[model samples]
Target chain A: NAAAERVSAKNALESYAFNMKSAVEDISEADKKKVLDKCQEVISWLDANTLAEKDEFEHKRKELEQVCNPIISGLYQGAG
Target chain B: NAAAERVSAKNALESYAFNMKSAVEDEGLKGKISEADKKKVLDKCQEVISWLDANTLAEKDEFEHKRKELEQVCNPIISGLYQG
Candidate 1:
């Protein structure tokens, strides 16, 4: 049970980053602070995390999204 | 891409149903399924698709159970599609 959930949380990491990276490109102009840096940080973490836990991966994933969500939403609403 | 594949069990069911449909239409897969069973699977595929759509907001437990029905039905064809 935990194993499957672990695999799922495992599989979700790259996918979450891939999608976030793609969409976050548009935000480069909107926020000069470079939201992509957080995305890059997550990917770097993902590279090193080939040997971490499900719970840890899930935690890292939410951390990245926690940063990206408000930024993405801000652009979504702020954009004309 | 695959994140979408199995994220929500609800999405998993629909994703699998489409894969089955595509397989039945493939040339190599015809060898995996018989003519009669092909029709039956095609039927089940549509049936499950509708079932998922009508019952979108179900529990993951229900969705997991639901995927098994479709999985069992297509196991043979699904199996031979990728023989090593």
Candidate 2:
């Protein structure tokens, strides 16, 4: 059912957002802000989007990742 | 040999700046970015290249620093556009 898919999708996004927020802590303040702000925006959107569809939740999660993945990748980039 | 190292480091940054400038112009990339965001990134890429043009005597640390700054600007814009 779409309901089952939607439930899992929301869970995936929730877990990702928290994981990213914690991971960004080790980066510079400027880099941290770039991600933290996006995380907060997504978290708030998640809170407000409780009844949103699976695709909508997935879409929001993708948008968050677009911003997060690059910055998070920078942590690795910065290391060497 | 330390000066030799600096030239290589500087060369790496120059090659990177040029490759990035060329790479981002492909239609695959152009499709994902807004004109405004594209210009912002393209501008920074050129800014780095322009600085590289004038700063020939800069040390490896400075070259490294410049590349890091350029990456900080470009990577996010590129991969962020990689999809959303």
Candidate 3:
């Protein structure tokens, strides 16, 4: 049972990696390798580009929405 | 009665003219004319510029008040005189 669980755990990790690659590549050989590399690059780029200010605009918008709407009247009515 | 009214009218007309020239020169002249005319001209410019019918002008004081009191208030009110 312990050996079987270890095999299952190993297979599950390999399956997760395969699924992740498949999502990017869509069941092709060269495309899988290319997309895996591209996904890694995109993750790095997205972190560099937007990680710092990700919540900044959303926070300001929420504050403004609170003042304007109070409870989801869904149309802005009062002071900007 | 007739003569006295004409004199008062003449004085009022002169006062209006003096005020208008002063308004234009004081207000619109410097920037475009003076603050007065600048205000007036900008008013004309704003007429072309655009405020909706629903939009009253900004608060009266917030306007260049002197430019307005001189030009904005009196200009339309005394339209007949300027036509002369």
Candidate 4:
């Protein structure tokens, strides 16, 4: 149950990552870093938490991340 | 903003499709369904009423119909679970 639930948050956080990535990808390197910084903040929060919590989180995080990763740089790629 | 705004019956109507699609998918014939059906059910309700009157409930009736359809779709999905 822990692994499967939290679809909603996962979807939302993924959306955030998508946006964060887009912000970084389109703008200059200087501007890109700012957008990525916030995304990393969220990713770090997900990682610092317990496995059960992060499991639920990463499931959602990756759902959005999949869509985002292709276009965005690797700045936050392995932050998890 | 009205295009994106929520109304009384619209929200209730949307809930039906979600419940129905979910029901059909999960219980063999009655259970878990593909996600596309879920969105279709909700989209149908969006246009059920462009406007609602204060005294009459014609607008509300449309919602009941969609809600019933959702339940109908879900019946087979949840039918098995009823045994448990």
Candidate 5:
């Protein structure tokens, strides 16, 4: 049960992150800030839940931390 | 006759641009966005409108083509906000 829910959350978060990344510089900085805030909320929820050792949960989290999170923060900060 | 028709077309385009600006930066679901984003989006829409105004469509088909172009541009903005 926990594993399935964690995967679901991760999937949703990934979708949001990908969409935000796609938005990139095409949208305004203000919009990026908004999306970043949303991502943080999603991350917070995910972190609170159980992350199973099964599958690629760890890999995805690392990817988000390395690629999605940092890039969005840097871009949003630069935009501001 | 052409002058009046041109004015009418301009008015309709302006209306579309305004709605598009509103749709931008909306934060609520698919249809809700921020007011600030709306203003920024409006600025871009205005630029497009300026371009449209300078061009003349001599025939019904020409005007229809222009309308379709604006729809192509504006529909994304609308659906991004309003579409589920």
Candidate 6:
């Protein structure tokens, strides 16, 4: 049930992302970049985590990347 | 800075909602929820918002303490259900 576990990890990561995203909403612009960088590190860590199934792994990785990229932009949008 | 205080309070509530949303997702208990229980949970969320709205502006420490208390109170319910 590795797939199930990856799915769970991804889900948990998404929660972390949500909290990180919210935390930066009112911070200084300089701090915004730092937080955004940290968030990208999160996304990178999740992306590098390989799922057993090749196709499913790529699919979820791409899904998370797509979701996370926009979050970064959104995080920046308000600050600048 | 009442408006700033409200912003901070609202942000804390947003975090609470995010945790609640994640809890529901992990549990996958949407359709199985009873109407009465749904109302109870929804009411509880709103009650917190109401409390925040009614309270006058206070120190960040007060809001931060409330945020932790909200998490402590809400997290256990979903976490306990999740563990079962």
Worst 10 residues of 2 chain B by lDDT: B75-84
Looking at model 6 chain A, report the run of 10 residues with the lowest lDDT sum: A71-80
Give the better candidate number (1 or 5) by TM-score.
Answer: 1
Model 6, range B1-84, lDDT digits (tens) per residue?
977765665565545644453444455675655445555555665666676667546566666666555554444344334223
Model 4 has a DockQ score of 0.01
Expressed as tens digits, the lDDT of each residue in A1-80 for candidate 2 is 98899998898788778888887875567878988999999999999999899999878876877678656654223111
| TM per candidate | 0.43, 0.49, 0.21, 0.26, 0.32, 0.36
Mind listing the fnat for each candidate?
Answer: 0.00, 0.03, 0.00, 0.00, 0.00, 0.00
Give the TM-score ranking, best first. 2, 1, 6, 5, 4, 3
lDDT of 5 by residue, A1-80 (tens): 97676676466445655566455545446756765665565466556754644344545444444334323433112211
CA lDDT of each prediction against the hidden true structure? 0.66, 0.75, 0.36, 0.44, 0.50, 0.52
- C-alpha lDDT (0 to 100) for residue A33 of candidate 6: 72
Tens digits of lDDT, candidate 1, A1-80: 98888887877766766776786665446452455777788888889887788999878766765556445544123211
DockQ of 5: 0.02
Clashes of 1: 0
Worst 10 residues of 2 chain A by lDDT: A71-80
What is the Å distance of residue B40 in model 5 from its true position?
A: 11
Tens-digit per-residue lDDT, B3-67, candidate 4: 22233444544444334434344556422444555455434434322222222244555645644
lDDT of 4 by residue, A1-80 (tens): 64455554554565565565555655246545655765676666655653435366655554434333322433111211
What is candidate 2's lDDT per residue for B1-84, written digit by digit as tens? 998888877876776676666666768765677677677767877998789879989888999888777766676565455325
TM-score chain B for all models.
Answer: 0.76, 0.81, 0.34, 0.38, 0.49, 0.50
lDDT of 1: 0.66
Model 3 chain B is weakest, by summed lDDT over 10 consecutive residues, at B75-84
Which residue pairs clash in candidate 2? Answer: none
**Between candidates 3 and 4, which one is better according to TM-score?**
4
lDDT tens digits, residue span B1-84, model 1: 543433456665776777667668788764566788799888888998888878877767676787777766765444233221
Minimum summed lDDT over a 10-residue window in model 4 chain A is located at A71-80
